[PDB]
Design a protein around this ligand. Structure first.
Ligand code: DEX
Ligand code: DEX
Lengths: 13, 241
């Protein structure tokens, strides 16, 4: 599982 | 209208206050650095989103570049600060949380604390200009990649030289535009190596539960993920020399 927060910031939606 | 270098100048995130309760156990202090470091890194993410050309790398290379370069960034920034603010003398993580010689005497700190200063030391040796600084800082993000490169290889490739271009420009402000590049790309080299230390420690402190060292959600997520990837040593430091 690549990191939750870091991801969401880059992707959004 | 406008220069990218000036765009760089504007996006650079504001210095952060640590909120440190400065009345001094060395577990606490490092726990705090971590708390601070989390937001610092959150700030570097917006800063990434608003780098020109970053959005059209591939989400994975975005994650990846950040995840691998993140310490490299924070340590670099910390060098710049510690340069500007005590001209090399002290580590200035936040205006409120400064490490004088005295706080290095603290249990486990010194080791790391000396190799953070080394980074500041290099700003002092080269007398780096703020424009020069920003430029590398960007590069440092694009300097820590897998051994088997990127999920959108081409795109990166151009960008990298783009910002190297910009570093030219920066020293252009004679017979320097290839000459000073040596002194300064030599730094971009020696980073990978000096980060190596801090990066490790950090790792040690992370998995070693029984130290009581506290790391915040953000960073946990990334360290705990970047851990195995760095176990393999499957990470390519792109240099110049
Ligand atoms: C527009 C020109 C072309 C520029 C060069 C473009 C290509 C290049 C490739 C390299 O392997 C390293 C840097 C260089 C060699 C360069 F990016 C800089 O050095 C600055 C440069 C010479 C320039 O800015 C100068 O006139 C320098 O005096
Ligand atoms: C020496 C290592 C590397 C350290 C980091 C070095 C870079 C940095 C600069 C800052 O201004 C904010 C926090 C960070 C991002 C950091 F200072 C803290 O997080 C604590 C840290 C991980 C460390 O002290 C630990 O491993 C503590 O567990």
């Amino acid at each position: 599982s690549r990191p939750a927060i870091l991801y969401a910031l880059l992707s959004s939606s | 209208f406008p220069t990218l270098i000036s765009l760089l100048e504007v996006i650079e995130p504001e210095v952060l206050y640590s909120g440190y309760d400065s009345t001094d156990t060395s577990t606490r202090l490092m726990s705090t650095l971590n708390r601070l470091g989390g937001r610092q890194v959150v700030s570097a993410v917006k800063w990434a989103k608003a780098l020109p050309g970053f959005r059209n790398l591939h989400l994975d290379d975005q994650m990846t570049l950040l995840q691998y370069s993140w310490m490299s960034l924070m340590a670099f920034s910390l060098g710049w600060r510690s340069y500007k603010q005590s001209n090399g003398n002290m580590l200035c993580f936040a205006p409120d949380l400064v490490i004088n010689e005295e706080r290095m005497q603290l249990p486990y700190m010194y080791d790391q604390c000396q190799q953070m200063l080394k980074i500041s030391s290099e700003f002092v040796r080269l007398q780096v200009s703020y424009d020069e600084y920003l430029c590398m800082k960007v590069l440092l993000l694009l300097s820590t990649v897998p051994k088997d490169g990127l999920k959108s290889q081409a795109v990166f490739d151009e960008i990298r030289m783009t910002y190297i271009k910009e570093l030219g420009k920066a020293i252009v402000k004679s017979s320097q535009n290839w000459q000073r590049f040596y002194q300064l790309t030599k730094l971009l080299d020696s980073m990978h190596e000096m980060v190596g230390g801090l990066l490790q420690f950090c790792f040690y402190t992370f998995v070693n539960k029984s130290l009581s060292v506290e790391f915040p959600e953000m960073l946990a997520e990334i360290i705990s993920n970047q851990l195995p990837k760095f176990k393999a040593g499957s990470v390519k430091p792109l240099l110049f020399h």
